[PDB]
Amino acid sequence: SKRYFVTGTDTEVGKTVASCALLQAAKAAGYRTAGYKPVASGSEKTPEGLRNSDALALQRNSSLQLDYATVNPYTFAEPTSPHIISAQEGRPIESLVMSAGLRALEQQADWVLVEGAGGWFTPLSDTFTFADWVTQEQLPVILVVGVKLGCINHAMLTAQVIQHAGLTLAGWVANDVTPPGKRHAEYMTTLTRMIPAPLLGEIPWLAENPENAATGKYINLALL
Amino acid sequence: SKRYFVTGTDTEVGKTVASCALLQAAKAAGYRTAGYKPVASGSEKTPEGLRNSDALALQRNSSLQLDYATVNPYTFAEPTSPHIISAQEGRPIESLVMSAGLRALEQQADWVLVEGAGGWFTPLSDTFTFADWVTQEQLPVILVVGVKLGCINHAMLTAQVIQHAGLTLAGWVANDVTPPGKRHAEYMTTLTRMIPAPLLGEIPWLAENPENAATGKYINLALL
Numbered sequence: 001s002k003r004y005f006v007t008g009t010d011t012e013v014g015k016t017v018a019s020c021a022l023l024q025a026a027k028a029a030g031y032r033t034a035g036y037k038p039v040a041s042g043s044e045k046t047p048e049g050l051r052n053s054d055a056l057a058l059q060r061n062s063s064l065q066l067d068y069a070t071v072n073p074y075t076f077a078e079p080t081s082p083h084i085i086s087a088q089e090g091r092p093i094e095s096l097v098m099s100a101g102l103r104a105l106e107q108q109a110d111w112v113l114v115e116g117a118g119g120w121f122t123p124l125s126d127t128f129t130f131a132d133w134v135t136q137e138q139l140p141v142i143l144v145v146g147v148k149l150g151c152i153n154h155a156m157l158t159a160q161v162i163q164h165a166g167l168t169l170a171g172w173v174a175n176d177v178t179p180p181g182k183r184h185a186e187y188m189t190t191l192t193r194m195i196p197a198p199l200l201g202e203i204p205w206l207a208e209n210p211e212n213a214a215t216g217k218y219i220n221l222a223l224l
Numbered sequence: 225s226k227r228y229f230v231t232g233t234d235t236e237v238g239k240t241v242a243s244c245a246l247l248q249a250a251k252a253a254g255y256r257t258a259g260y261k262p263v264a265s266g267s268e269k270t271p272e273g274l275r276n277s278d279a280l281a282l283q284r285n286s287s288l289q290l291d292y293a294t295v296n297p298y299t300f301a302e303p304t305s306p307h308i309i310s311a312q313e314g315r316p317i318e319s320l321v322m323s324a325g326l327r328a329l330e331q332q333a334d335w336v337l338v339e340g341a342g343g344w345f346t347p348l349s350d351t352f353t354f355a356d357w358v359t360q361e362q363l364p365v366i367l368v369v370g371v372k373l374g375c376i377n378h379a380m381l382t383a384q385v386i387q388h389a390g391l392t393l394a395g396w397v398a399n400d401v402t403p404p405g406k407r408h409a410e411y412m413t414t415l416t417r418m419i420p421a422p423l424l425g426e427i428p429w430l431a432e433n434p435e436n437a438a439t440g441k442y443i444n445l446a447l448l
């Protein structure tokens with residue numbers, strides 16, 4: 001079955017909004033979809049335990065009815081690097097557990113989207129990064145580019161490191177994090193030339209709750 | 225003579241403040257210093273022509289009295305990617321001109337600091353990036369890390385790409401862009417472990433005009 005890892009040019013650039021758009025497009029195409037956020041930091045207390053908003057968005061945008069822990073096995077309250085809060089709470093983040101969770105979703109879904117945390121090299125322990133896990137799993141990567149000053153450099157750095165790891169950069173998504181600026185079209189043209197993967201679509205600036213907006217229409221899944 | 229290229233984890237992270245600190249430390253060590261900002265975008269009109277604030281800071285922090293054009297040969301008014309404003313104004317950015325300017329500073333200085341624009345891969349034309357020029361010149365690179373969420377990934381991406389190019393990562397500078405946060409010490413420890421170059425110093429959060437603050441004391445030039 002189809003599996004994709006979604007990374008971003010940084011944290012706070014649109015990975016989650018773009019991931020919901022991708023999931024909606026896959027559902028429209030007839031797939032049995034599932035979103036997976038194996039590691040999440042920055043979560044709120046509920047009667048059932050900690051709940052992360054990215055994980056909730058991926059759960060709500062899956063075509064299948066999935067239990068929260070299946071979408072997000074590792075949940076930390078504080079919004080910092082996973083390795084830091086993991087060490088402080090004495091809750092190791094294990095590659096094998098993250099992989100087992102992906103296999104469990106593949107039991108019922110034929111199209112799985114995995115959202116990373118932060119950018120490409122976010123640490124999970126003092127000797128293991130998210131990039132190490134993606135490399136182990138050999139997942140094709142989708143790059144979410146938050147369109148803003150400095151995004152060209154971040155997109156190029158990320159694309160180069162992914163290719164060096166021997167991984168496939170399956171495509172990129174342009175996310176309009178702010179209202180239209182002066183050099184928007186020139187930035188889009190530059191990003192299109194420089195990123196060695198197909199532009200899958202552009203998500204417009206949607207001020208109010210973009211995670212629940214009908215955004216699947218902005219993704220062309222036939223390019224993926 | 226000694227020459228260093230200063231890059232950053234992004235634009236707006238402290239390259240200019242850190243570069244002034246480096247220049248001040250070099251002057252205290254007895255060097256005849258010069259700052260060079262070959263390409264600058266985001267400049268103000270004056271009777272003499274456009275003047276960029278980064279270039280002015282580097283000029284003021286040089287031990288030698290340098291003419292503005294020697295510090296910054298290419299000045300563009302609009303604060304966008306250099307390649308975009310260069311193409312619109314029909315003023316090509318030439319590698320040979322940038323290199324000639326560095327040689328001209330080496331006529332009088334024995335310690336030259338070159339500040340880049342934006343991050344590592346900022347484009348200068350549709351076929352040439354700042355990274356291409358640094359590679360041509362074979363300059364040792366100093367990485368300025370703005371300490372904030374997402375800086376670990378950006379520092380690691382930048383360090384990996386520099387090393388891939390066959391260049392030397394001479395050191396890194398921690399810049400406290402905001403007041404102290406909860407995980408400051410853990411972030412510093414992680415950055416120190418992961419960046420394969422000596423930490424040259426840490427510049428504290430200095431709200432008022434940090435470019436003219438006496439910051440040379442925060443750099444240990446014997447580690448460079």
Ligand SMILES: Nc1ncnc2c1ncn2[C@@H]1O[C@H](COP(=O)(O)OP(=O)(O)O)[C@@H](O)[C@H]1O
Pocket residue numbers: 008010011012013014015016017018054175176177178203204205206207210211
């Ligand atoms: N296209 C969009 N239009 C407007 N707001 C957006 C859009 N994309 C993201 N946002 C907002 O920006 C912030 C970061 O987006 P998110 O998808 O959570 O990024 P990341 O997952 O990389 O952290 C969120 O508050 C989100 O609601």
Ligand SMILES: Nc1ncnc2c1ncn2[C@@H]1O[C@H](COP(=O)(O)OP(=O)(O)O)[C@@H](O)[C@H]1O
Pocket residue numbers: 232234235236237238239240241242278399400401402427428429430431434435
């Ligand atoms: N250590 C510092 N403390 C407080 N303000 C800082 C500090 N470093 C940079 N700044 C401010 O942050 C902004 C970006 O810093 P600058 O050195 O110009 O970054 P870059 O050169 O990477 O664009 C500027 O307004 C600068 O005055």
Ligand SMILES: C[C@H](N)[C@@H](CCCCCC(=O)O)NC(=O)OP(=O)(O)O
Pocket residue numbers: 010011012015016039040041042054079080081082116117118119121122123372373374375376377378
């Ligand atoms: C707190 C932030 N939201 C994030 C982790 C950010 C890690 C930054 C690691 C670094 O400095 O590079 N946790 C999260 O679950 O993922 P994204 O929000 O980036 O999607």
Ligand SMILES: C[C@H](N)[C@@H](CCCCCC(=O)O)NC(=O)OP(=O)(O)O
Pocket residue numbers: 148149150151152153154234235236239240263264265266278303304305306340341342343345346347
């Ligand atoms: C406008 C900004 N200040 C800067 C260029 C930013 C280019 C961003 C190219 C990209 O998107 O990666 N011009 C400048 O002269 O250098 P720094 O301010 O980053 O020092």
Ligand SMILES: [Mg+2]
Pocket residue numbers: 011012
């Ligand atoms: Mg986020």
Ligand SMILES: [Mg+2]
Pocket residue numbers: 014015016054115
């Ligand atoms: Mg997210």
Ligand SMILES: [Mg+2]
Pocket residue numbers: 235236
């Ligand atoms: Mg700047």
Ligand SMILES: [Mg+2]
Pocket residue numbers: 238239240278339
């Ligand atoms: Mg600067």
